[PDB]
Symmetry: C3
Subunit: 311 residues, 3 copies
C-alpha cells in the first residue's frame, strides 16, 4: 500500500520545507488542542483555545493525492470537546464528526487530499463561532503534483478577529463577548493571535534581493481582509488561494475562512508593514506586522529625503 | 420581428431551468408578477415579504446570449405600492426599471437584448430602492454563452439575502422592516432563499455520490458581501464574480452585494454538506445555512469515519 | 541619465492623457497639502485634509520604468504634518518617511515605478486612519511599457467613507468622529469627496457608441465597495487593478486601499448610475454618481415601455 511518512509541521511564522517526493504517501499528522491564557496586548490577557499551544495552529504541508492521517488529542485540562474541519478534506464536516474528541481522549481518522491549494482548518464544535473566535484555526498547504516555484523565503500568516467584553486596552483577563461577535464588532484584529506577534522583536526577516512568498489565511470568524504590505507590490497573487494567478496587485481580498498566496521581491532594506487595509483595523485594533529587510541601500529604487526647504 | 418566439421555462428555487439546446437567437417571452405576502421567516416569526412570483428569490430565468427577452410584468391588485425590475443582464436605462414601473393592478411590457453571457441579479428598483430589495424582491437570470455551458449532473439556484426586523432575531410575531438597522448594515437574519431553513432539514438539496454539482449563487444583499463555502467540499471551478474567468481549487469565494458566482464540485461520498456564509456568525446565528444531502456508498479511501478512540 | 518631464496631473473626474513616450523619463510631480472646509452635503460642512485642494488628490500618470520625483509641500496654514505613501513605490513607507513634511515646509524625494498598475496613494502620518478619513488619498496610474488599449472616454473615481459626529443630514460644521471610525460605521459614503460630486450638474458625460474606461479607487479608510453601474455590464475588469482580466461582470469588489479598472461600451442614451451595491450606501449615504449618455435610441438593444394595461 502507500508508504507512511511523518509530517513536518511548523509554528507560525515558519513554513515546512518543500516536498521532494513524486509519489503519493500516507502522511501522519499529530495535533493536540490546548486551552491556555496568554497576553493579547500589554496588560490584556485572553483565554485562548488553541491547536498545539498557539494561534494559528501549526502549518501542515502535503502533496496532492496524499492520504492525510490525523491523530487528534484533546488535553485533559480542556473544559470542552474540540474537533477539526479541514477545508482540504472532501467529506462530512471536513472531518469534524470523525475527530470529535472529549478532554483526555484521542481520535484518529484519515482523508485523501484531492485538490492542491492553501486551506484553512478550524474547530467546528458547537457553538462554532466561539471555538473559532477563541483561536482554533490554521492552514494546510496541499502542493500541486509538480510543486510550487522556488522562492528564497516563506512565511505563514493568519489574520483573526477577537471579541472581548471590555474595550481594547481594558486591562486584565478579558472574556469572549458573544454579542459583539454576532454584531461583527471586534475589539482586536491581529496576525498570529496577538498584538505584536510578528512585529517589533518578533518581526519577520529577509535580505535585499530575496523573493518572498506569504501563505496568508483568514480564520475570521467574521472579517474579510484587504491584505497589503506597505512599501511592496504583489508581483503574483494566487487569487483566493486557488490556481488563478494575478499580477501587480497592491491589495487583495482574503475571504473569511479563506486564503491567498502572495509573492514579491524585496529590493532594498527597510521596515515593511503587513496590514489589513481596512485601516483602522491595522493602526487601532492590532492588524499590523513587520518584515525587516537588511542589505545595501539603492537610491535608484527609492531615495531618502533629498531636501527640506521653506514653503 | 422575424425571430421565433419561445415561452421561457422558469423555476422556483432551488430548481434551475433546463439547458438551452439552441445555437441561434430567439425572442423569449417571460411573464412575471409581483405579490406582497406574509410568510414565515423562522419558527414563530412572520415577515411581510415583497416578491417576484410569490417567493424569495424570484423565479430563475435562462436564455442565450443574443436573445431578445420580452418581459410582461404584472403587479397584483392587492399590492400597496408600485414595483418594477432592473435586470443586471440588460443594457440601458435602469436595466429595464424605467420601462417596467407598474402600479397595482397594471401590466407593463418591454424587451431587451441579452448582450453578454453571465449570471445576473435582477431586483426591484422602486424608491426607496433599499427597502424594496430588503423585503425580498430579487432573483437571477442566467445568460448562457452562445456555445452553452458544460454538462453537469445537478444544478441548484441559491440566493443569499440580509433582512432587517424591528425586533431582535427570535422575537415572535409579525416583524416590521427596520430602516435604521438597514442603514447601519446590522441585519437580524441572513438567509438563503428567503427564510431560515429554506434549503435545510426537510428542504435540503439532494444528490447522489459520483454526481457533478453546479450552484448558481446570487447575493441580493441589500448590504452584505458573502464568503461562500460548502462544508466538506472544495470548489473545483469558480466563475469569478459570475464572469468569464475560471478559478480552480478554491475553498471560499466572495459573492459581491448585487453580484453572483457560479461554483462547481463533485460529491464523491455520501453525507450532509452544509452551505454557509463563512462570516461564520451569520451561518450559525443568523440563518445563513443550507444543506446538501448526498446518498450512496461510503468510500474510506476518500475519508474515513473515526478509526479509534483512546485515552490521552 | 533620464530626460526630465513635468507631470500632467488632473482633478477628478478627469484623467491625464495617454502616454505616447517609448522611453523612460524622470517625471516631476508637485503636490501640496491643504486643510480646508468644504461642503459635504446640503448645509453640511466638513474640515477636509486634501492633496491639492480637493478629494481625491490629482491623478498622476506615468510609464513603467519611469523615475517619479516628488516635490511635496505642506501649506503653512496646516495644523499637522502630512506625507505620502505611494502604493506604486517599492521601499520604506511607499515614500512616507522621505516625504514627512511639517506645515510650511517642502520635501523632495524620488522612486522608480517598477510595476504597471493602478495604485492608491495616501497620507500616512499618525494617526493614519484619521489622515486618510479626512480625505488624503488619490490614484497614480503606471502604464505598461506598451500602453493600455485605446478608449474614447476615461474617468477618475475614488470612493471614500467619512465619519461625522452628527448623523447624516445634521447641519453645520461636522467634526471627525473617531469612535464611529474605529467601529466602521460611517455617516457618508461618497465618490470624489462630497455628496453629488459626480451627479446632477456634475455628472460624467459620454456619447452612444463610445467605449468608457473608469479608474476606480477605494481610499477607505474601512469599507470594501461592490462597484456597479446601473444599466451596464462590465465588458472588461482588471481584477483588483492588476493584470488579470475578467469579462462580463455585473459588480466587482474594490478592496480598501485598492483599485479596479472597468471598461464597457455605452450603446444607447440614458442616465447610468454609479453605485456601491451595498445598496443603502448608494441611496442613503451618498455613494451615487451619474454618467449621462447622449445619442440615438436603439429599440433592438432596449425598448421603452411598450404598453400599460389592466391586470
Ligand atoms: Cu474547539
Ligand atoms: Cu470552515
Ligand atoms: Cu418593489
Ligand atoms: Cu442592482
Ligand atoms: Cu496627512
Ligand atoms: Cu496604503
Amino acid at each position: 500500500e502507500l508508504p507512511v511518512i511523518d509530517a513536518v509541521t511548523t509554528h507560525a511564522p515558519e513554513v515546512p520545507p518543500a516536498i521532494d517526493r513524486d509519489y503519493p504517501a500516507k502522511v501522519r499528522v499529530k495535533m493536540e488542542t490546548v486551552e491556555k491564557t496568554m497576553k493579547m496586548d500589554d496588560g490584556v490577557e485572553y483565554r485562548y483555545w488553541t491547536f498545539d499551544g498557539d494561534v494559528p495552529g501549526r502549518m501542515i504541508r502535503v502533496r496532492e493525492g496524499d492520504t492525510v492521517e490525523v491523530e487528534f488529542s484533546n488535553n485533559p485540562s480542556s473544559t470542552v470537546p474540540h474537533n477539526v474541519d479541514f477545508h482540504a478534506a472532501t467529506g462530512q464536516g471536513g472531518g469534524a464528526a470523525a475527530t470529535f474528541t472529549a478532554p483526555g481522549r484521542t481520535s484518529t481518522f484519515s482523508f485523501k487530499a484531492l485538490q492542491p491549494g492553501l486551506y484553512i482548518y478550524h474547530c467546528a464544535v458547537a457553538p462554532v463561532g466561539m471555538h473559532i473566535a477563541n483561536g482554533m484555526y490554521g492552514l494546510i498547504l496541499v502542493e500541486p503534483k509538480e510543486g510550487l516555484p522556488k522562492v528564497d523565503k516563506e512565511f505563514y500568516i493568519v489574520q483573526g478577529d477577537f471579541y472581548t467584553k471590555g474595550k481594547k486596552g481594558a486591562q486584565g483577563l478579558q472574556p469572549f463577548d458573544m454579542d459583539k461577535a454576532v454584531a461583527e464588532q471586534p475589539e482586536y484584529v491581529v496576525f498570529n493571535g496577538h498584538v505584536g506577534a510578528i512585529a517589533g522583536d518578533n518581526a519577520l526577516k529577509a535580505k535585499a534581493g530575496e523573493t518572498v512568498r506569504m501563505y496568508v489565511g483568514n480564520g475570521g470568524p467574521n472579517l474579510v481582509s484587504s491584505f497589503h504590505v506597505i512599501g511592496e507590490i504583489f508581483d503574483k497573487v494566487y487569487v483566493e488561494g486557488g490556481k488563478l494567478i494575478n499580477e501587480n496587485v497592491q491589495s487583495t481580498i482574503v475571504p473569511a475562512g479563506g486564503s491567498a498566496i502572495v509573492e514579491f521581491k524585496v529590493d532594498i532594506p527597510g521596515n515593511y508593514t503587513l496590514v489589513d487595509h481596512s485601516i483602522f483595523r491595522a493602526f487601532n485594533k492590532g492588524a499590523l506586522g513587520q518584515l525587516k529587510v537588511e542589505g545595501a541601500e539603492n537610491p535608484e529604487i527609492m531615495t531618502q529625503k533629498l531636501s527640506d526647504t521653506a514653503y
